[PDB]
Design a protein around this ligand. Structure first.
Ligand SMILES: Nc1ncnc2c1ncn2[C@@H]1O[C@H](COP(=O)(O)OP(=O)(O)O)[C@@H](O)[C@H]1O
Ligand SMILES: Nc1ncnc2c1ncn2[C@@H]1O[C@H](COP(=O)(O)OP(=O)(O)O)[C@@H](O)[C@H]1O
Ligand SMILES: N[C@@H](CCC(=O)O)C(=O)O
Ligand SMILES: N[C@@H](CCC(=O)O)C(=O)O
Ligand SMILES: N[C@@H](CCC(=O)O)C(=O)O
Ligand SMILES: [Mg+2]
Ligand SMILES: [Mg+2]
Ligand SMILES: [Mg+2]
Ligand SMILES: [Mg+2]
Ligand SMILES: [Mg+2]
Lengths: 443, 443, 221
């Protein structure tokens, strides 16, 4: 534990906290919150704050279905931005039906349950270090984003002169006051692109920290007259924002991927784990890669995983086991993007490794070669299958797979497919500016 | 014949024809040509006009390969439009390999085949009535197409006032003084949209006529300060211009579908010709609707099909059949849009008849009841199939189909796939205005 | 203060949501909820069943007070989280008298019809009067349509206890005038000044010739 019920109460009083945000998460990964005044704290902690629970299913909403909000006390946090009357606090919450029981459609409760399937196999932790990237634009007069990037820096440049803006520098400062464990932070490939990297953490613990990131980003961005965005491929020709995910399975406090007594220095647990992330890969991309734009980033060329392979050095090696070992022995999945729902994306990768280990799966050869270099046939001569290329292709892969569907189960799986099918359709039925420049005269 | 070689000379001289156009057609139905002065006509009729045939690949051309231009004397036409130096004349020609054998990758010499493959099955004529719809936009100051519709007319309306603009009437009169057998026209559903149907004609003459429609339309349009276009879906959310194809097969000069004494008034040739067309439609879609934009018209509700089946009436059926019998016995295919190459559309359509007539296949239930009504679990539960949604669906689907693959013949085929795969890749790798506006803030 | 204009206009923009103001009503009797009943069907007394039963009758009639603007009815168009149909449920999309699962004191009957445009004091007058008239006359609540109602055809809805509400304000009035229980709920003075003022409001609107009316008719006709 990290906070006593009395611990929360005292902080508020002496801290003039005057407004509570009971935040949680709709299906698309959007940050949701119902807020209440500090005077309704009891009602919150006693888990009796109700709300229209149908907000979780995003835009596919049908009925008004009342539902409960159970605050995780450990999530509790207070923001350095004070109102003109009182500081504000937050509470990451779980959603319960009116019958005291978990709501299956809640992505938070959908990961707590794939973590359990984990325990049903002995493990104690599944740690998670995300490498979440983003872009910062300028805001015009009214307050809209333009497409004027914030800075003209490139890969790892000392890239914004310290005296001045430094949204990156100033975010990483406010994040550390809020009790985050930031590893580093550099300037990514395209001008105006930035990356901040996290210290590992319990899955759901880190997911909570990936919502808090995205939220503190877009806020401080705004504060610097800017506009932060997590769209994967904001612009053609430039880089796309990724969110590599450093994963590892501990057992009784010890990294189960490690073995300084096996080929490649990888426990036979790990090899298996890897095994399954490949089987399902095509079948779980629709979750790690929710949006239409996400696939404009998975075109071979801008260092983005097009190819289902497991190396250590490659141009788009979908899987990458980095240098370090021991405690820090972990698989890297380089194909996620910032838009991926963390809670879900995580449940879907686990369920992947899990069915992998659970069924003892036989891992392929590490294509140490550069995969990119060859033709699709040369790439077919080995186990090189490229990913789904359109949201449709990715959504069909998903449905056809059974282990990814129990990873989300009836409710979640049911509503995701619908929202996404409408989304694609919306995009396909549309006639784009490109089609007119490309056709209106040619035909 | 229609013009002896003697007459051709009789006409060039007497009509002060000073410039000649040896017109042909590349893989995407773009009207290509080569411009020789009249002082150099003889060389042409003798079949000795060399040219770079890699141009028939359009934009996928690679190396400059030598080819010969053999004219079709029957195609001799003189446009009213004269540079102030003399008049212009034309010839639709067959592209002939330099050794003298017909080039097999040429679109006109590839239907001339599937007609001989029809001739080599008993029939004398494959006839065609095309219903070609085109939009009219106002050219701006700079002489740029704008999205201004030339008028706000509507279905079958009295389109632009007579005295005023009426550009559609003009286009028709210019085609009257050119030996075009046109039946009747009207104003189409959308504002500025137009339709102009000709009498029926032998597959080749009808296409020849098609291609030449498109040119005179575009041309009579600029004259009136407009841009006419044959783009399936120029504007999202308004009608799309599609081009129906009324097919009828003759056998000894009489309709082989008619039968005043079989069910519905159609022979077993008819029932069979339909029966074949049903099979491969899904598969010959990637040729009747060749643009990414084509599928932005095959969206339910726009007088445009989505479902593979025949009827007597029906909203937007795929193979509706007109009540009219006799010679006017025929099977309309409402799928095609004005974007398809006239010569290839017919190749593939004849091949899915001849394959149905040959194998004696059997036509499913002519769904006479509305099909847009039935749920996806009410349609595909009968003979009712969706067509491909994206072009890449249509291709993957078109590649895997021996009867169509063979209808075009190795050369045409593979260059087609490539060029088309190139077209889709371009489109999927673009990041449209929509993709930002749906994702630049939300994410 | 923050350089903004907040508004309580039911339907400021065509084709986007409309701001409506629900009203969760509960009648106490000796300090305790008179609707609750842990031992009657659905968990509602015969007072509850009756209070609903009255509200159903006159809704069509007290609509011209819960949604007082011409614009109010530009929100009561199917699909915008806003009712059109007179009936109660446990769940339902945009029901008119949905009832929250919560019981105890928190036993209550929500009326989702009202928009922020109604006069707070008159909305309640008329709503209390269609309860007290239901509780008094002991009226009986029809079938709580628990199944979706937006689904049923006009020949599938009005074939049950399901009624449309008035579409135009003038429908709502003609309909509100002819209704003794509401006419009496407000009392001669308030009533007649209300009709007038309102009749004035509609007349103004019907006699205007909007931009739409030209753009749909200036060329076509
Ligand atoms: N047990 C673990 N589970 C998941 N990720 C981890 C673990 N340990 C380290 N990582 C991640 O691996 C990445 C590589 O950083 P590195 O400097 O090699 O790590 P360390 O210094 O901890 O060995 C970091 O982003 C970190 O978040
Ligand atoms: N014998 C035929 N075979 C194929 N198509 C035909 C034939 N006769 C006419 N058509 C075409 O069919 C279309 C439908 O017109 P419709 O008025 O039904 O024809 P008709 O009056 O000749 O029966 C016309 O645009 C025309 O070009
Ligand atoms: N598009 C990149 C993002 C990460 C980076 O810029 O290194 C990838 O997935 O590899
Ligand atoms: N142009 C439409 C048909 C509408 C019409 O001709 O009225 C189509 O086939 O898509
Ligand atoms: N404002 C809507 C309800 C939508 C909501 O509260 O989410 C109405 O009652 O018309
Ligand atoms: Mg990186
Ligand atoms: Mg990395
Ligand atoms: Mg038509
Ligand atoms: Mg027709
Ligand atoms: Mg409510």
């Amino acid at each position: 534990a990290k906070y006593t019920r009395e611990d929360i109460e005292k902080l508020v009083k002496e801290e003039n906290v005057k407004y509570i945000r009971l935040q949680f998460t709709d299906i698309l990964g959007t940050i949701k919150n119902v807020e209440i005044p500090v005077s309704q704290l009891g009602k919150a902690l006693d888990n009796k704050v109700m709300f229209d629970g149908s907000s979780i299913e995003g835009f596919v909403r049908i009925e008004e279905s009342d539902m409960y909000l159970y605050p995780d006390l450990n999530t509790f946090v207070i923001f350095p931005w004070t109102a003109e009357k009182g500081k504000v606090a937050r509470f990451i919450c779980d959603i319960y039906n009116p019958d005291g029981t978990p709501f299956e459609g809640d992505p938070r409760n959908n990961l707590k349950r794939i973590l359990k399937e984990m325990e049903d196999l002995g493990f104690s932790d599944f740690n998670l270090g995300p490498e979440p990237e983003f872009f910062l634009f300028k805001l015009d007069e009214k307050g809209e984003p333009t497409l004027e990037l914030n800075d003209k820096g490139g890969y790892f440049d000392l890239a914004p002169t310290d005296l001045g803006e430094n949204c990156r520098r100033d975010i990483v400062l406010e994040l550390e006051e809020m009790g985050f464990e930031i590893e580093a932070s550099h300037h990514e490939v395209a001008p105006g692109q930035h990356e901040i990297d996290f210290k590992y953490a319990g899955a759901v613990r880190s997911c909570d920290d990936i919502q808090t990131f995205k939220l503190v980003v877009k806020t401080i961005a705004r504060k610097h007259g800017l506009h932060a965005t997590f769209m994967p491929k904001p612009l053609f020709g430039v880089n796309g924002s990724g969110m590599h995910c450093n994963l590892s399975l501990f057992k009784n406090g010890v990294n189960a991927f490690f073995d300084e007594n096996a080929d490649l220095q990888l426990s036979e647990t790990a090899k298996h784990f890897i095994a399954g992330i490949v089987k399902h890969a095509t079948s779980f991309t629709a979750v790690t890669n929710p949006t239409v734009n996400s696939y404009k980033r998975l075109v071979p060329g801008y260092e983005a995983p097009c190819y289902v392979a497991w190396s250590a050095q490659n141009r788009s090696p979908l899987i990458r086991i980095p240098a370090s070992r021991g405690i820090s022995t972990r698989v890297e999945v380089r194909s996620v993007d910032p838009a991926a729902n963390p809670y879900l994306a995580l449940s879907v990768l686990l369920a992947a490794g899990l069915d992998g280990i659970k069924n003892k799966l036989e891992a392929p050869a590490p294509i140490d070669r550069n995969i990119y270099v060859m033709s699709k046939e040369e790439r077919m001569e080995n186990g090189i299958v490229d990913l789904p290329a359109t949201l449709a292709e990715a959504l069909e892969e998903f449905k056809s797979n059974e282990v990814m569907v129990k990873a989300l189960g009836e409710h979640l799986f049911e509503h995701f497919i619908e929202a996404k099918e409408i989304e694609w359709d919306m995009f396909r039925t549309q006639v784009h500016p490109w089609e007119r420049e490309q056709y209106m005269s040619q035909y």
